[PDB]
Amino acid sequence: HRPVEWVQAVVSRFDEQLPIKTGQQNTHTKVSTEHNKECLINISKYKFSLVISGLTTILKNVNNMRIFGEAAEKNLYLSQLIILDTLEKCLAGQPKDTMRLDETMLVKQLLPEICHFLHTCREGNQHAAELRNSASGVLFSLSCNNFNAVFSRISTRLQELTVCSEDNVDVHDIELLQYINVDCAKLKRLLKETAFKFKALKKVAQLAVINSLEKAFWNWVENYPDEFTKLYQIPQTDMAECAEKLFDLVDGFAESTKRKAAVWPLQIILLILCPEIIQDISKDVVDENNMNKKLFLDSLRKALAGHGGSRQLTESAAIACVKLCKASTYINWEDNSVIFLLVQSMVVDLKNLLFNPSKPFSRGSQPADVDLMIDCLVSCFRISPHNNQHFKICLAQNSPSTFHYVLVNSLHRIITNSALDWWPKIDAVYCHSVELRNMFGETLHKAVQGCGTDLETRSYKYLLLSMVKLIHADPKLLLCNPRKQGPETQGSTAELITGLVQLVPQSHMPEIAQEAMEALLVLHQLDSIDLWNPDAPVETFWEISSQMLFYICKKLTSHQMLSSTEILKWLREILICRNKFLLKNKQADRSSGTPPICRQAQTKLEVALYMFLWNPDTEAVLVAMSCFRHLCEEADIRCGVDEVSVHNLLPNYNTFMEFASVSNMMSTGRAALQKRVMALLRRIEHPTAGNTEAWEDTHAKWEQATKLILNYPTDSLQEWINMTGFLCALGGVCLQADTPVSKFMDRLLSLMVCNHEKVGLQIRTNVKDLVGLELSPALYPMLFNKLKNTISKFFDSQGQVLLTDTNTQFVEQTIAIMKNLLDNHTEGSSEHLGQASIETMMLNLVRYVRVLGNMVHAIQIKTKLCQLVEVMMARRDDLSFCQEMKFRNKMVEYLTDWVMGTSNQAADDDVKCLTRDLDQASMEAVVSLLAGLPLQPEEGDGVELMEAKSQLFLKYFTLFMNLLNDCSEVEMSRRLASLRHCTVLAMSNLLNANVDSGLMHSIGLGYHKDLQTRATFMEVLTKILQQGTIRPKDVPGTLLNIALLNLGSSDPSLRSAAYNLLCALTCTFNLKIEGQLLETSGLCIPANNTLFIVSISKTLAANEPHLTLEFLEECISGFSKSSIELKHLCLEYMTPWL
Amino acid sequence: SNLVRFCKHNDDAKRQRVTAILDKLITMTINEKQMYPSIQAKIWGSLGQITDLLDVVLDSFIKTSATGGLGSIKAEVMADTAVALASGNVKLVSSKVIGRMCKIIDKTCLSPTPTLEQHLMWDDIAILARYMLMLSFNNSLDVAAHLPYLFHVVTFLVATGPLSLRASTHGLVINIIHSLCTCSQLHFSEETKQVLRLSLTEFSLPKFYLLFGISKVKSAAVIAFRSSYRDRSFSPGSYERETFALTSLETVTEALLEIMEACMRDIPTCKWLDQWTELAQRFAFQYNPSLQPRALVVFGCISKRVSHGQIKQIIRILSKALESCLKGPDTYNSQVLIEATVIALTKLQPLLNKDSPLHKALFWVAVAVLQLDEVNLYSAGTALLEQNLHTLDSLRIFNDKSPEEVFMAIRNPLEWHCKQMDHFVGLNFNSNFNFALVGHLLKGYRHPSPAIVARTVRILHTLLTLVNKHRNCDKFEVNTQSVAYLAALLTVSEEVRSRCSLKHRSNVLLDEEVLTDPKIQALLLTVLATLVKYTTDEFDQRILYEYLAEASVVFPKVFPVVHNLLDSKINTLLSLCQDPNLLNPIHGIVQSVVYHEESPPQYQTSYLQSFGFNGLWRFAGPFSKQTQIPDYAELIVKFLDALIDTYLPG
């Protein structure tokens, strides 16, 4: 129930992926839509009827579909091609069930749609050629079983034509005989049926049956060779009788010379079928039985010898005789019948007609019928293979080119199509190898010269292509009788390879270049390696094979070619195919040699496998990466032990393995892929000849490409980016005054300020992007020194800034480079940040921005520089500082000047609301700078150091306080909330480092007016007390009043912070109270906290008197500042002290 | 300072006069804001040192606050004033504000309500809680004597009320612990005090803010207190109120129990834990739909001894809870009295006698609860099951017998009621024990919480290691008994996948030498078909289809019972899938089906209904959004009733 409905899905998905049907991009790289086909083919074996019927309707629907346009036609052509190919595989795949009860589908559903293509179908000169070729194979497979169905249709058409007397030209039904599979018994039926009805047919019908019946003979002979032999082995009267009756009818039909020309090819086939009539023809002739036959046979020879003055018959006699010669080959000749004798009579005459160099036999438009000559020569070879005498005629150099063209193609069929075993084989021709090679050399010499008469030149290219395909089919044919290397001259196997190699990078003759690749790839199989030099097969291979690599690799690097991505896919397999010969060679005998060429050619392979990583084509880069395994796996074979050599012969062995994994990833745009390549390119630790010359060679290309982009007043640019990214990530290898690496930087820095109207903007956007996020961590110490020196000359003598519009563009870029550079944490960077001193550059950077002025533009620079100084204080442990503290003070000096509040209201422009952000940004810089910083005053004037600091501390304290008062909400809520929070955190860090010099100035924060700010100063003060265990140990009484005053507050988060301060005091100073106190966070302390305070104060006063004087002095001072309600409290706990 | 005599003036109606004077004094305090620090020290500080007068003074505080309301100023101020009153006699105001709370809660039984907040007496409870918050600081709630009665109320209030009342309960706990660390009446060794201080820090972590229900609150103190509490009354809003989960209450309830026991180690012959238990045991077994569920989750979490007579009551509160659900239209009300009865049993079994029948008959309560199809009831059912196996091991009951033998032997006396349930649930326990006990454990994979998924995987391993150990078969052998638990563990346990590998890539699952029974191989295919019908994951669908292709060939005859289960999802995959890894095995399935066609189907799709398991694929569906009792719960009530009658006669 369900499974039938499961198949429908497999069928239904088939329709929706036919190009004419909307593609919808469901191919999924064609892997998903191709898998469905295989299922459809497999299912057909058990549900043959269902699948086939489904397929016909898909074909019928496509036929009755009208579409216009160049896209439209191409889609439907490719659409119908897939259906037919699939449909044939189902028929062939199906086991020989031989169920002949498929009549229902064949008669109506299937035959009419297959028959449609077999018509001329002149819509496409190239398309219809394939459809007939593909469709015919379907009809042949179908005819195997259901012969009666096809055969019945033909019988009807004959009867219709027979009775009717108005001649019609719709003979296409008749012409199906050319394709239906035929057997001996079936063939008899065709002859008998046509014999009865032949006489009454019209003229046109008679010709079609004759031609089609003629081609029917060859299908039987090829497909059933054995049955043909038995025909002559044992007599069969029935076969002879039917042919004889048909023979006479055809002869009666043909009277004119034009008619005789048409029918002669067939008549010989019929005569061949009746053997004994030939014998009698040789001897005395019967009155009528063998009278008509003998007249015809001798009439043939006259024209074959040129005696008659009729050209048309001369051409026809040629065709007829050739078929007789071809048919003879199948007869074993053990019978030695007259067939062999009859051919011998005509062979000598035939050759002089077809193989006379003086006179070229020209059947028609072509200068000579090239196909016909191939049939003759191939057949004659099989009859008399021992010493052919016309092989030499063609093989001779003086003979015309077409004779050469016929010779190789003739040798091409011998190798590829030899069904019968007892025939001779190609081995007999090996003796002529020496002459074959010379022909290759001369044709190669003249073919290349022409590219760099009209048809003579074109002739050579066709001959050259055929020669290359020959080496592809069989390489031993041309390698026999090797010359062996002369003392002063190269060998013969070498000269062959050098000729084949120089065709690969041509691109003048793309078809040949593709073929020479396959030819050179077959001479590398383990079988064919031996033949190069049988004396020593493991010494000439590396001498030549390696020397081929050196030639091809040097070509790829030199310049870009259209087919570069295709030579690379071939070059991968050469590497696969020369590892195996090294693997097996080493196993049998290590002894494997490494002459200088093996080194001088191993380098150039690497110098070309780097330079393909920055190639724009995604496929080229992916393939290049996978070619690194085959460079690695060769290392193991030469030396198995890892440590001894695998990291000594190939120093960067470990990273190369990483290239492989990344290649095995889903495809993504060139930008995403370049990120992964540049990561791996950055881990090449060890200098090598391959690295240090892939860097220099691609630098010279980079330098010249730049001039073209700039000087000339998108694909051109994208390459410029890729060469730059590559040439930065891989800088470290070539490292180690004037040098190629240093000149890269200078030119690189002279492009951050590149003012070019045409494309200037895109250059700067990318040089900033790369030098920051992609430079190699081995070049920081050199980037900083050059970046510093460029700046230092912005200041004239006596330290006066020289504003210039470009100088302002350079500083804005040096900030974005530095920020990205520092912000990113990567492997190995840390060790290198240390070498250089970044201080002197940072100090000079602010002064220039300090003098820039005020405007919407210059303010945003001030913002970003402040964010850089924040990031430079998260990496302070990594960096190197000559004088850390003396440098952090000046920055605080230079940054406080920019924090100016309420300047956007006086400016009266909301456009300058940014100034709020500059104050927000400046403080975050000053928090980070101050965290842990002792104060140190510049010794420009002579004052006591201790006094000097206290003056300094008050300078910043008042500054923060003033900015704090403005931020009060009563005097944007988020802005003020954050800025106020920062301004207290900035103040806390200032006090912690400098308790000794700044505690006195700071006590006034205890009674500040902002409740949220009083809690923080108390937490800071709790922290300071515990770290230890006016100095903080000399004012126990001054703090104790702050704790007790703020315990009665009205802010629930200011009571708890005050409870904790009280706890620190008793432990730190051993104050004795009644109960116990335990520091904590999260307590909910009640508001009516009055009798608690009075109880602590009463106790301390009783048995802690020495605090009295300093306690009361503060309590009175705290009375005035507090409010009315808190004033009543201060009375309550003050009295116990009096 | 002289009202002592008048307060008990022979009830001559002069007593009515003093209360008027106090009510007048209360009004000065509300209005004279500026003189507040000085009224407290003089009027209330000193008036609160007269023992005989404390009872009447306190009473007026509550009455004045009552009229204002929970957020009213009059009630807000009287909460603060009690701090000064209580400083004179901590031992007397504490044991009189606590004693009123414990009684208001005890009167909610009379007119039970779906929740406290809808009760009439709610407003009385809310204000009395603000008194407890304020008195807790500095040990003015005498913990050294009232710790039992403070935890008892904390557990009945956690995560109830407006967000102001929820930050108050958190603060109250932080103050009871702090008072312990800084109390002199108790003498805690230096070992104990380290335990307390870690507890003090833990409770302030973002973990416990979530348990109390005040996540998204930066600090609790701020929300608990309001600055302008004298000028204006509180203005509650955002009535949207989070829910509470009885699993949260255990995590808190055991955090407190850890604290208390540390103290009892030092305090000799302490009675704290025996007093707290008595308070819980009184609300646990008394009908009050607002307090009963919480008083069961607490009764079991702290109790140290349980008897048969107690267990019968717990299991008969579960029988009446089910009956109400189907009778009435109010469901959620009584679907939390069930989840609480199950959570108690998970804790009280490990205390039962070593030789009691119920140690084994609590495997059918766990099973009969998974059959109710609710995410919470399912989650609680496994936790009772998982520990039922763990407990029986430590009692060494699976030594010479197999799971099927133990649990199916005790079910025999009450087989008649059990038989009918199996008919409707569509699984059978007489036919095949180990396949009906995995139908219930395949729904676990559909639970929203990723923590109940891993608990059902552990319950599979622990069952697997017990069936094989009965046969001494290395814990990964494949047999008729131990094949169900390996199909379930196939897609989650790597050691199962490697040690049981598909033949057409040790021993290979699907062996036809041992799995030579038509029935035992019809079931094993429904388990594999089911696991993919609802699964949605590439890694799972890959592994499960490769085992179904190989099943198509090795078991040609019985495979047609797996079409409708595979029918729909494959049909969709064929049309639209674009994965070579996942599209290969599906093709292998289609080809095998057509090949082995051309024969009259020997086994139809309804082959499983014949011998019981017609519901196996249905019981593993997703949990229904339309939460309702499956309505064959009328039989679970009779089963539970017979279980009690047979094993707890009286």
Author numbering:
A (entry chain N): 4 to 455, 482 to 620, 674 to 795, 831 to 853, 887 to 1121, 1134 to 1191, 1845 to 1953
B (entry chain F): 1954 to 2458, 2601 to 2745
From the paper:
The autosomal dominant monogenetic disease neurofibromatosis type 1 (NF1) affects approximately one in 3,000 individuals and is caused by mutations in the NF1 tumour suppressor gene, leading to dysfunction in the protein neurofibromin (Nf1). The ubiquitous Nf1 isoform-2 splice variant Nf1-23a (2839aa) is, together with Nf1 isoform 1, which lacks the 23a insertion (2818aa), one of the two biologically relevant alternative Nf1 isoforms. Our high-resolution single particle cryo-electron microscopy (EM) structures reveal the domain organization and structural details of the full-length Nf1-23a isoform 2 dimer.
Three major dimer interfaces between the protomers exist in both states. The N-terminal HEAT helices contact the terminal C-HEAT helices at the other protomer, each contact burying about 950 Å2 of surface area. The resulting dimer is connected in the centre, forming a core that buries almost 3,000 Å2 of surface area. The disordered, S-rich region branching out from C-HEAT helix α103 and returning into the core at C-HEAT helix α104 could not be traced. Flexibility and solvent access are consistent with the reported target for phosphorylation.
